[PDB]
Amino acid sequence: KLPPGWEKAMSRSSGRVYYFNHITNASQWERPSGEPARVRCSHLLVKHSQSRRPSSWRQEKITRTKEEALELINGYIQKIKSGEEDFESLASQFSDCSSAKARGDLGAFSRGQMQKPFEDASFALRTGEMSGPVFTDSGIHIILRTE
Ligand SMILES: NC(=O)Cc1ccc(O)cc1
């Protein structure tokens, strides 16, 4: 059927079928197209008060709730998908990760190096594909697989 990780779903608001990936939290209308030793990804991290280190270059003390963090993530995803903003621009401006200064680029990595939900989403993404909200102990990620 579908490249594993993917399931069919029904829009509650339109009744149209769409596809959801439970590893990447990506969702799309089209039927999904369908592993390498390494992948390259960028990300945009929004931390919250329960993050492993509730601090970043943007904010000495990160006080926002997980819910508020997810709302910010959802808004970034919306602007990226509409083309109002580029992933790289939002990462540089708003990612709570030091990789903001590199447009969110983390370089290439193997399995075993990253936090598990991040790794699984990264490796389940296709080249050029973007995740939905991915939750780790650092916060909530938008992940872009670049290679
Ligand atoms: N550690 C991971 O698995 C992803 C990650 C989380 C926070 C960062 O500041 C950079 C990378």
DSSP string, 58-110: S-SS----HHHHHHHHHHHHHHHHHTSS-HHHHHHHH-SSGGGGGTTEEEEEE
**Ligand 1 near 140 CB (within 6 A):** no
Helix (H) or strand (E) holding 109: strand 105-110
Ligand 1 close to Cβ of residue 138 (< 6 A): yes
In what order do the strands lie in the sheet containing 134-135? 105-110, 38-46, 140-145, 134-135
Number of DSSP helices (H) and strands (E) in the chain, helices first: 3, 7
Q: 1-32 maps to which CATH number?
A: 2.20.70.10
Record: fold of 38-147 = Chitinase A; domain 3 (3.10.50)
- Name the segment(s) of the chain with CATH classification 2.20.70.10: 1-32
54 CA to middle of ligand 1, Å?
13
Residues of the chain with CATH 3.10.50.40: 38-147
| 7 beta partners | 20
| Closest protein CA for atom 10 of ligand 1 | 97
Resolution of this deposited model, Å: 1.8
